[PDB]
Design a protein around this ligand. Sequence first.
Ligand SMILES: [Ca+2]
Length: 448
Amino acid sequence: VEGAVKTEPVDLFHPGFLNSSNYRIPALFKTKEGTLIASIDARRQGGADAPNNDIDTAVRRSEDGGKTWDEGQIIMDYPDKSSVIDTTLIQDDETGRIFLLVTHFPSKYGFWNAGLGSGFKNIDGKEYLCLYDSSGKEFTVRENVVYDKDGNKTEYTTNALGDLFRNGTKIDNINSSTAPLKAKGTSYINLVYSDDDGKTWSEPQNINFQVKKDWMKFLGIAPGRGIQIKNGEHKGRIVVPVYYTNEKGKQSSAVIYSDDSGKNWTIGESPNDNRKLENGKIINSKTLSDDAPQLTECQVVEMPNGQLKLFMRNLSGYLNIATSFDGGATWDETVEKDTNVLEPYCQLSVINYSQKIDGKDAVIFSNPNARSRSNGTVRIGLINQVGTYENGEPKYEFDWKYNKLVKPGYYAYSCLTELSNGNIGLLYEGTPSEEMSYIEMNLKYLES
Ligand SMILES: [Ca+2]
């Protein structure tokens, strides 16, 4: 219509950018200062997931509302087919610190063959990263010094990038396929941060010791963004969607969260914990042994009173939504299936919108509206309180009042942001692993 805006797509990442052949897995976030940060997997050896690749994390910034973007930078890169995969962005409003988290695998490891547990061992009240030699002998890294099983210092030291030094000379990296001492072959959650609006980034901090349980095999970032809670008793809490597998390989969603501006993290329960299924049975994420109830990648939004809603990739064919009354620590037993929203087993994006639409609080949602990864559609969901739970808490559901096709044909992972001008930015996989497309839309367009 007149005044409607939908910009022509720009290839924000593409083959050749930063000398990467392939790209996947978008994250997009507007900072407190108004800067757009876009992160992505720079998939260097094709488009496949780890372990069949060598994947680095790339970031671009825009200081003019997404009209122009910088030359990009690689902010994490491990050697020899060790990969960082699946990024997420959030910022602490209090300190201004921006966080990017990502899943990290040593060479040869991925989802399917990840070992159990955090990869850390507790020695006298502190968690230390374990290393193993080819015989399976176990060592610990204590303040970057490698100790043997009997507590004796060895000739080895490490750095935060995993480099392995013998008497101060680098010989390998503990994440490579050739190191004489290697980290456990499993998933790790890495965190980096920026205190200058995304221009420079810290080295990765491995937070597996805080968030990964002994019985988890895979634990990964659910890519996109996090939130910081605005209302209620958990105001200020930083919440980052994740998902994990149990010993039987079955997937369950959750969030990790920090109440101290990102310094310390913990993981909450999954909506699969004490979940009541349609058949009336109760399950738990630790014991889940069936494929059908799996809950995987997810994104979280906040209701008017602070209540959290976790929107989840799943196997039902439709959107699933979980509810938390305690800031992500636990979830209500009922996972809602919203049959107005197809979910063809793919990542989705959902964000809060800052102003009311048609007199209602609203969210913006993006995914492939089909039984395949196609028909990419952005929706406006208006929030309605439809009743209360037995515990007296408000019960909220969504009215998907406006639903707009934005990408005919291929559409896979995506990430939304609200822009400074009130419009919506969207970075999406409009090709399987090549060009990643950015557009800006206004509400006039979305409602048309
Ligand atoms: Ca690399």
